[PDB]
Design a protein around this nucleic acid. Structure first.
Ligand code: MG
Ligand code: MG
Ligand code: MG
Ligand code: MG
Ligand code: MG
Ligand code: MG
Ligand code: MG
Ligand code: MG
Ligand code: MG
Ligand code: MG
Ligand code: MG
Lengths: 95, 64, 49, 95, 243, 110
RNA sequence: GCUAAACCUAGCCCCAAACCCACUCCACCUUACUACCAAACCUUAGCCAAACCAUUUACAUAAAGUAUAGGCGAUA
RNA sequence: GCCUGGUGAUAGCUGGUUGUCCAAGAUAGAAUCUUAGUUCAACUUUAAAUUUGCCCACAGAACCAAAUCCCCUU
RNA sequence: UUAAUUUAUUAAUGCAAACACCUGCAUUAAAAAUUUCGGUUGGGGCGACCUCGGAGCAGAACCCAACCUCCGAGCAGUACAUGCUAAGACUUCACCAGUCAAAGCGAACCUCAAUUGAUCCAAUAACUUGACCAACGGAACAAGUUACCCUAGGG
């Protein structure tokens, strides 16, 4: 996403009012573009013997492309929610 | 016993009960007090009058 | 000024003189907007006080 | 200047004037001398002593500065440890 | 002269006059509300007050949101809380150059999802921020049932929401026929968002579309006055029978 | 505004002093103000007209103009140039003589 | 003495109060006023002012033309 | 192009500015994209405060004509 | 147009994003778009000039023009108390700027005529420094031309 910032500062409006803008408050400045950031890994629990990234039952952190493209559609992985980490602690307690 | 002011005796437009201004101030006050429910071309005429009277009081005359 | 207020009954010196008592005797007009932070005593008239 | 604003219908101060001048309550405007911090290497110390002074203003300069500010700026100010406070009231004029 | 009511109240008055006033209250509440969306295209400020450096005094700060433009394809797909930013720039980030206008468009991606409640693969145009919010919600069913109507800002996402909420409001056997355990597992996974069926029909309807639905509810063939007059007359002859 | 309290001796430390009882048998009379001060006010106009006003004068203002004019003329040599305003009941003298007229009117008993 | 001259009252203006209208029958988006066949939203710009112009330039009370912003200037 | 709107556009330029009667009242200049204009000054006007103003006699004002400055008396 | 300012618009590249198009950020082109084209002048143009000082005009207090007559200036050198303060004055016909200065504290025991540049802004911790802004009271940055010119006026 593209985060901008207004050049010209807005006079503040009060508590029960909306800030009425001018044509100079439409002049923005690009503070950030999110796509050009260091990309994060996501945490998934694999539910099969998937390739070298992990084995059954094991929570790992994958690149988002591999996680959203190959693992999560095909039922190979489930999200690292606080619902199923319970279910897989309790799966690991039955071995 | 000062329970009412005499200005609460006068009846008239709601934007000039107990208030006196010149014409630019009457127009500004009328726009901010009652301008939201003014008719369309009355509101439009009044915006143009403030714009004219602005450009007259502020940029024209003899004394400065 | 304060001797003047005490002499004319406007500020009662047999009670504590807070800032409310200087306002109610109308000895000092202070306006909190215009950022007055209150009264300062002033040495004028120290002799004959 | 603006004699009647579009929002309030009041006079406005010219903020250049406030940014450069000092109104004493008796009506005198104090200013700083032009060029007091320019090219000091080529000025004689008499001249540099003259430029580092707080110089009063003319009569018509004073009335021009009165008309360009509003009554807020013409007001008694009882500051705490004001440097200019002994110069507000005008002592010992015989007109 | 003057109107009795200001003009920005006029719309509101139309929600009391005619066909709109017979709408259910939980719908008109959902139109009257004005809560703000999550900031997508601007950093919010931290707090209410903020000490600025130039004079060292704490001064109150609001955060005025950037106006976002949503082309109608944003309502065909699931974008985040985001769309185009129609604005202007100074030419080389100094105000003493040409003020010239700029549009910031997001990056779109045809992806594909699997709603477990509807049990269907949708091909949706989506953005990177939407994929991220799906990951943070732990699934598209949660992403749609959790996100507010204002924040979600898609007609299609709200139609998915009405679909899922009617599927949960009815406990539908049509989710997985001949597999009741899977139905009960899916329905108990999203037990959190149980809404009555009388409210789940009106979720995400536009005002014109709700006007239509309410118009079809209370349309009736008129009762032939023969039957009304027969009812009144048999009433009167049964008052004469008891005399 | 309160009546000022009764003091033991006069004048008070501020120099205040009440009007005397009975009122003196002059042809004229000067009231006090709200605040029980004797009403002689300075007044500038044009930046150079220094002048002084005796204000709540009730009675014959022409006797007061004769007596003020007889009082100030040793302090000037000439008779002071005045103006009675018989309607409002003021008397307006040219030049500041506020402290001298306040002291003088305290002597007279007003 | 011709041409003429005169005339009050149609109505209107500004407020207040009050939230308006709209199927006799028939015809009326085709060449409207014709009886009857196979698709909507997307920054207003500029004038003007700055004595040029190029950033910029207004669209209850009181705090207050204050804090602020600004070719730190016009001004806001 | 033409029309409507912004729009009572703007015009340091042209033209025009409506009863009576009285009074006071004309020629140094400096800056300026300035010399068709403005700002300050000079001159002008009213009101106010005060005390001198004007005319001027001796004396006096530099070395490399006519006069003026200064100036008590009057 | 090789005036100034843009690249919003297209077309290419390059880099990111994504797993060619699209999006984001740069860069180069084309197409344009916005705005401008100072003043003096025996009508105007060419030439010359535009600020500061000396002399004549202007003979003797001050002031006095010209596209009037002649010289010059846009520094150099020495010193590092060329420190700090402060009565009273002069003043380029305004303002802004300019000048002179006793006493004092602290110490020793400037020449030249002109020899220059406001405000804002920058740079700097600070002290300070910053234009042939020479069109020299200086717009932060804008050229030629129109017998197609147009309008408002003047001779
Ligand atoms: Mg007075
Ligand atoms: Mg202009
Ligand atoms: Mg005009
Ligand atoms: Mg003009
Ligand atoms: Mg005359
Ligand atoms: Mg210039
Ligand atoms: Mg002109
Ligand atoms: Mg003399
Ligand atoms: Mg002079
Ligand atoms: Mg020039
Ligand atoms: Mg010049």
């Amino acid at each position: 996403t593209v985060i901008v910032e207004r050049w010209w500062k807005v006079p503040l409006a009060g508590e029960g009012r909306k800030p009425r803008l001018h044509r100079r408050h439409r002049v923005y400045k690009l503070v950030e573009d999110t796509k050009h950031r260091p990309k994060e890994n996501l945490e998934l629990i694999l539910t099969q013997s998937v390739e070298n990234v992990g084995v059954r039952g094991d929570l790992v952190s994958v690149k988002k492309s591999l996680g959203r493209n190959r693992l999560l559609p095909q039922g190979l992985a489930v999200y690292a929610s606080p619902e199923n980490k319970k279910l897989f602690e309790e799966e690991k307690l039955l071995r | 016993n000062f329970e009412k002011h005499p200005k609460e005796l006068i009846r008239g437009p709601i934007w000039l009960r107990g208030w006196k201004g010149n014409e630019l101030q009457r127009c500004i006050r009328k726009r901010k007090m009652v301008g939201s429910r003014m008719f369309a071309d009355d509101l439009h005429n009044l915006n143009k009058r403030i714009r004219y009277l602005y450009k007259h009081f502020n940029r024209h005359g003899k004394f400065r | 000024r304060l001797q003047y207020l005490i002499d004319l009954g406007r500020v009662d010196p047999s009670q504590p003189i807070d800032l409310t008592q200087l306002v109610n005797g109308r000895g000092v007009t202070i306006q909190p907007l215009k950022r007055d932070y209150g009264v300062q005593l002033v040495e004028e008239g120290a002799d004959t006080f | 200047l603006t004699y009647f604003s579009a929002r309030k219908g009041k006079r406005k101060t010219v903020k250049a004037v406030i940014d450069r001048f000092l109104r004493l309550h008796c009506g005198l405007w104090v200013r700083r001398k032009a060029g007091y911090k320019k090219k000091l290497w080529k000025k004689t110390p008499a001249r540099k002593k003259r430029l580092r002074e707080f110089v009063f203003c003319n009569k018509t300069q004073s009335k021009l500065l009165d008309k360009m500010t509003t009554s807020f700026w013409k007001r008694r100010n009882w500051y705490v440890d004001d440097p200019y406070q002994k110069y507000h009231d005008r002592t010992n004029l015989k007109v | 002269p003057l109107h009795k009511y200001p003009v920005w109240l006029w719309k509101r008055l139309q929600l009391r006059e005619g066909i709109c006033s017979r709408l259910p209250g939980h719908y008109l509440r959902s139109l009257e509300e004005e809560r703000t969306p999550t900031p997508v295209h601007y950093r919010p400020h931290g707090a209410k007050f903020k000490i600025n450096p130039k004079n060292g005094q704490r001064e109150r700060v609001e955060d005025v949101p950037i106006p976002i433009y949503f082309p109608p394809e944003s309502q065909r797909g699931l974008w985040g809380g985001e769309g185009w930013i129609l604005g202007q720039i100074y030419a080389n980030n100094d105000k003493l150059s040409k003020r010239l206008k700029k549009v910031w468009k997001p990056q779109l991606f045809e992806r594909e999802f699997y709603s477990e409640i509807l049990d269907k693969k949708f091909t949706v145009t989506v953005t990177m921020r939407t994929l991220d919010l799906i990951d943070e919600a732990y699934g598209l069913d949660f992403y749609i049932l959790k996100t507010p109507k204002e924040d979600l800002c898609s007609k299609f996402g709200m139609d998915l929401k009405r679909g899922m909420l009617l599927r949960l409001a009815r406990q539908d056997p049509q989710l997985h026929p001949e597999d009741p355990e899977r139905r009960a597992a899916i329905y108990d996974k999203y037990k959190e968002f149980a809404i009555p069926e009388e409210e789940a029909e009106w979720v995400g309807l536009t005002l014109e579309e709700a006007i239509e639905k309410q118009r079809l509810l209370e349309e009736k063939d008129p009762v032939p006055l023969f039957k009304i007059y027969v009812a009144e007359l048999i009433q009167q002859l049964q008052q004469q029978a008891l005399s | 505004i309160p009546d000022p309290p009764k003091h033991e001796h006069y004048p008070t430390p501020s120099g205040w002093q009440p009007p005397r009882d009975p009122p003196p048998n002059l042809p004229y009379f000067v009231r006090r103000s709200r605040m029980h001060n004797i009403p002689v006010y300075k007044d500038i106009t044009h930046g150079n007209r220094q002048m002084t006003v005796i204000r709540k004068v009730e009675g014959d203002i022409w006797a007061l103009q004769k007596d003020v004019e007889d009082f100030l003329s040793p302090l000037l040599g000439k008779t002071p140039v005045t103006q009675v305003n018989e309607v409002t009941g003021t008397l307006r003298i040219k030049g500041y003589f506020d402290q001298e007229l306040k002291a003088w009117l305290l002597e007279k008993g007003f």
